[PDB]
Each structure stands twice: as C-alpha cells, then as structure tokens.
Ligand SMILES: C[S@@+](CC[C@H](N)C(=O)[O-])C[C@H]1O[C@@H](n2cnc3c(N)ncnc32)[C@H](O)[C@@H]1O
Ligand code: SF4
Ligand code: FES
Ligand SMILES: [Cl-]
C-alpha cells in the first residue's frame with residue numbers, strides 16, 4: 001500500500017524495497033502525502049530559514065567531455081570566457097553587500113586557475129566574513145588541501161549517478177570510482193561535502209535512483225543537489241528525453257526523509273523544466289536556494305543546459321528575486337552561514 005510505504009518511511013525503515021516502491025508508485029494521493037512528509041521533516045529539523053548561496057559561474061572553460069553538459073570540451077559552438085581574479089573577488093563583495101552569507105564559486109574544469117589563483121581568490125573572499133563553497137570538479141588531493149588551507153568551507157561535487165557503468169559512459173574522462181574518491185577526500189579534509197545526482201539520464205533506471213538514495217544516505221553528505229537531466233542541443237544527448245519533474249521532486253523528498261538535517265537546494269534545473277519548479281521544491285524538502293550572481297556578459301554563456309533561468313535578468317536581480325520568493329513562501333532568509341546543524345539521533 002501507498003499507506004504502508006508512508007508508515008515505513010515515517011518509522012525510518014529505509015529498505016531498498018521501500019524506496020523502490022515509493023519511486024514506482026504513480027498515485028497522486030501517495031505523492032502528495034510523500035511531499036507533505038518531506039515538507040514536515042524539513043520544517044522540524046532545519047526550520048523555515050531558506051539559505052541563500054550566491055553563485056558566481058566564473059569560467060565556462062572545461063577540459064572534460066561529459067556527454068550531458070553544454071560546457072563539454074567538444075562543444076565548439078560556445079564562446080568561452082574567464083573572469084579575472086579581481087572581477088571574481090569584487091563580484092563576491094557585491095553579493096556580500098547584497099546580504100549573501102555564502103559565496104559559491106563554480107566553473108568548468110578550467111586548468112588556468114588551479115590551484116593557486118583559486119587559493120588567492122578564496123583568501124580574499126574569506127576576509128568578508130562569509131562561507132565559501134567551491135564547485136570546480138575533480139582535482140588532485142593536493143589542490144583540495146590547498147583550498148581548504150586557504151579557507152574554503154564547503155565543496156559541491158555531485159556524484160551524478162551511482163551506476164558505475166552509466167557514469168563511465170556519460171563521463172568518459174573519469175569514473176564513479178574517481179568521483180567517490182574525490183568525495184571521500186573532501187570529507188576527510190573537513191569540507192562540508194555536497195553530492196547528488198541527475199534524474200532522467202538516458203538509460204537510468206528506477207533501481208539506479210534507489211542506488212543514488214542509498215549512496216547519499218551511506219555517506220551522510222552535508223548537501224545534496226538533485227535535478228533533472230535537461231538535454232543540450234550541442235551535445236551527444238541532444239535528442240534524449242528530459243528528466244521528469246515529479247520523479248525528480250520525489251527524489252528530493254526522499255533525500256530529506258533519509259537525511260533530515262542535510263542542506264538541500266531547490267536547483268536551477270528544477271526551475272528550468274517547470275515554471276515555479278524551485279518554489280515547489282522548497283515545499284517538498286528543500287531549504288536552500290542559489291541565485292545566479294554571474295555578471296553579464298558571461299551569465300548567458302554558462303550554458304550547461306538550455307533555457308536556464310536568470311539569463312535575461314539584470315546583474316543584481318537574483319538576490320532580491322529570491323528574497324521575494326522566500327517571503328511569498330512564508331519562509332525566512334537564513335541568518336547565519338547556513339552550515340549543517342546535525343541532529344544526532346538513533
Ligand atoms: C556544470 S558542472 C560545474 C562544476 C564541475 N565542472 C562539475 O562537473 O562538478 C555542475 C553540475 O551541472 C549539472 N549538469 C551538467 N549538465 C547538465 C544537464 N544537461 N542537465 C542537468 N544538469 C546538468 C551536473 O550535475 C553537474 O554536477
Ligand atoms: S559537468 Fe563539469 S566537468 Fe563535465 S563537461 Fe560540464 S563543466 Fe565540465
Ligand atoms: S534567482 Fe530566481 S529567477 Fe534568477
Ligand atoms: Cl553551500
């Protein structure tokens with residue numbers, strides 16, 4: 001029964017069978033109950049604060065060739081850009097001036113900055129009294145060590161898919177084993193460590209999604225970023241189907257149920273495939289929002305997938321936009337850095 005699966009989730013009997021059935025049931029009443037459960041767990045464990053992470057996508061140069069990603073190296077159609085270190089620091093300062101308590105630096109895997117330019121930038125942003133999150137992809141342990149020494153607080157490295165065969169096919173420069181070793185290294189170095197997957201990748205099954213949930217639970221990640229796969233026309237996956245919003249939303253809800261004290265963003269991809277998708281996701285277990293703080297003329301060139309929200313908006317629009325969002329949702333903006341606040345339990 002849908003009823004029995006909810007009871008088992010409520011009782012924290014997180015068996016593969018329970019998770020598979022939750023993901024497989026396509027009953028509206030069940031889905032709405034699951035979303036309510038996640039929303040309640042979110043409210044109880046992490047409260048009504050929605051944490052704002054200002055993201056600066058500072059370079060779209062990439063050395064890797066992931067089949068799903070518009071920044072893949074084989075995409076010749078794309079104008080490549082790099083913000084200067086001074087531009088990045090001053091852009092971060094403007095976000096802090098707008099009230100951002102976390103700055104997220106994200107890029108393609110761009111060799112130019114690695115590792116010392118990143119270290120310099122992180123040190124300057126840390127002087128501003130905010131959290132710094134890096135999302136720069138896979139690099140040697142030494143680089144991650146230098147960045148932690150420089151003051152970085154968190155690292156987002158989505159695991160993408162926990163199916164090693166699918167992972168290797170979609171990410172031909174690397175492997176799930178590498179990705180996992182990176183994530184374990186980040187944990188060992190003391191970063192708040194973020195993982196998470198895409199939903200609806202070509203060839204990905206419900207069993208794969210269950211494996212993603214069990215992977216996340218196993219490693220007790222501090223942040224989990226989940227979103228639908230969105231096909232990009234200048235990639236080998238151009239003609240594949242987009243991920244299903246409702247299924248992806250169920251993954252978010254189950255992640256909250258499994259990791260009740262984690263930080264879980266309402267990802268931009270959720271807002272891209274369905275108008276108002278981020279707001280929905282914030283009401284089904286998410287507690288974090290990541291407004292775009294990349295300046296023009298670069299914002300429109302960071303084309304991981306098409307249709308990406310925020311691209312046509314003014315340079316400073318997105319922090320005010322999410323503050324309005326937070327208020328109309330009956331929520332509150334985060335007061336502190338929004339680090340993970342563990343609730344130890346049984
Ligand atoms: C663009 S990468 C930038 C950071 C770093 N290069 C990395 O791969 O971790 C950020 C995230 O974008 C997501 N992404 C890339 N292409 C996508 C697509 N077509 N649809 C949805 N998400 C996508 C992936 O999950 C990835 O972890
Ligand atoms: S997902 Fe990250 S590593 Fe892969 S091509 Fe895109 S930017 Fe490069
Ligand atoms: S942050 Fe909401 S549209 Fe840009
Ligand atoms: Cl973060």
Ligand SMILES: [Cl-]
Pocket residue numbers: 227267268269270
């Ligand atoms: Cl995203």
Ligand SMILES: [S]
Pocket residue numbers: 292309310313317318319321
């Ligand atoms: S925005």
Ligand SMILES: [S]
Pocket residue numbers: 318321322325
């Ligand atoms: S927004």
